[PDB]
């Protein structure tokens, strides 16, 4: 009732119609986003920061990981040299909510080299118990990401559509290569963390700080 009325007030006072407006370019967002992400990439010790960050998470959660694997060390890790591109930005009503809230709908595409270098063994029991676990150097990459993303504010609600494109470029080395079940399994775990946290119908709400101008937030140069 009055909720849909409020959404109508927003839409009317904003030069926007849900059924007739065309998509928007959104490139400046890719420019400033490219600035921030260039800034995060150029942090030299953040490569080690997230080497440790990924390590710590992986070790505790290892029971969810396949049991035939041993200890998981990361010896290689690359971030890339390209940037994500947003385009086709829409505004729709929130589904299943009878016209309660509004939300943006942006297309996103990314192409670069996104690699992680694993070093693991493969144990089996109970002979003898403990086996001559062979070594695996598992360099796994991601190269393309096309997604249809939903944003909104109530916090920062955003998530992906389940019909997303995720392209993996996996390689391994065992004792003394291009072995597929490795890449398919790493795909299972990666898309398990991903769908577990950041895919419909499971969103991620991020805290919204106050933007009000305050004197403890004023600098110059």
């Amino acid at each position: 009732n009055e909720r849909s009325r409020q959404i109508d007030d927003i839409l009317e006072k904003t030069y926007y119609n849900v059924d007739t407006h065309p998509a928007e370019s959104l490139d400046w967002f890719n420019v400033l986003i490219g600035q921030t992400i260039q800034q995060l990439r150029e942090e030299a010790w953040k490569k080690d920061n997230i080497v440790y960050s990924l390590n710590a998470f992986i070790e505790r959660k290892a029971q969810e990981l396949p049991s035939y694997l041993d200890s998981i060390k990361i010896t290689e890790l690359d971030i890339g040299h390209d940037f994500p591109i947003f385009s086709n930005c829409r505004i729709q009503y929130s589904p299943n909510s009878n016209g309660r809230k509004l939300e943006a709908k942006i297309d996103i595409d990314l192409n670069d080299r996104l690699a992680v270098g694993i070093e693991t063994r493969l144990l089996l029991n109970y002979p003898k118990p403990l086996t001559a676990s062979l070594p695996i150097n598992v360099t796994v990459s991601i190269i393309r990401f096309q997604a249809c993303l939903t944003v909104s504010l109530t916090f920062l609600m955003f998530s992906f559509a389940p019909e997303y494109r995720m392209e993996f470029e996996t390689q391994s080395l065992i004792g003394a290569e291009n072995i597929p079940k490795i890449g398919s399994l790493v795909e299972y775990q990666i898309k398990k963390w991903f769908v577990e946290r950041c895919v419909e119908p499971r969103f991620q709400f991020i805290k919204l700080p106050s933007v009000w101008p305050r004197s403890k937030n004023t600098r110059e140069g």
Binding site: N125, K128, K181, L185
Partner: protein, 197 residues
């Protein structure tokens, strides 16, 4: 492709020693034995020091018969295809009473100790772990998994010279060989598979 346990992990295990003395002694003590073999018994068993040589060559997720045996009684499962080469130092001693019957029937009964040694094996194998039920299967077909074996016989010094005795001795030895390959090809050869727990 590199595997290597210097599997001393077994020799401290007198538990495994007596486990194979138990399973092996049990497979010998229950058999439709021939008439010239009164009793079969394993006395001195040892698994040895040298371990076999293993090379992995293939890897898939499934094989559609392990899941048959499980569905009778997930994508996170795995199976390996490997090449097994045993040429090491396993030794079995089998006691046996030999009804020797050359001159007449039930002529004598000999205290006989046989030694199976120098066993050579070479074949392919698959192993399916299904989070985490473990299964294993062999692939070389007509019992040719046993390619090398050396069974020698100790009898008494007093009967070391009669070839008539050595005929019955040879019959017992090759019977042991045939029940050996029969045991292996019946228990393990494709399709047959087993779990270990």
């Amino acid at each position: 492709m590199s595997f290597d346990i210097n599997w001393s992990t077994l020799e401290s295990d007198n538990r495994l020693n007596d486990l194979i003395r138990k399973h092996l002694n049990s497979y010998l003590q229950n058999t439709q034995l021939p008439s010239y073999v009164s009793n079969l018994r394993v006395l001195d068993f040892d698994l040895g020091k040298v371990g076999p040589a293993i090379t992995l060559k293939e890897i898939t997720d499934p094989l559609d018969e392990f899941y048959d045996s499980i569905r009778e009684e997930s994508p996170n499962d795995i199976q390996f295809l490997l090449e097994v080469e045993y040429k090491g130092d396993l030794l079995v001693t089998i006691g046996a009473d030999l009804v020797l019957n050359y001159p007449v029937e039930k002529f004598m009964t000999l205290p006989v100790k046989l030694s199976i040694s120098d066993i050579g094996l070479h074949s392919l194998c698959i192993v399916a772990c299904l989070s985490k039920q473990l299964f294993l299967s062999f692939l070389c077909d007509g019992g040719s998994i046993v390619r090398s074996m050396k069974i020698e016989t100790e009898i008494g010094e007093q009967y070391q010279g009669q070839g008539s005795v050595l005929r019955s001795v040879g019959e017992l030895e090759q019977f042991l060989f045939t029940i050996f390959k029969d045991f292996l090809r019946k228990e393990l050869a494709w399709p047959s598979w087993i779990n270990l727990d």
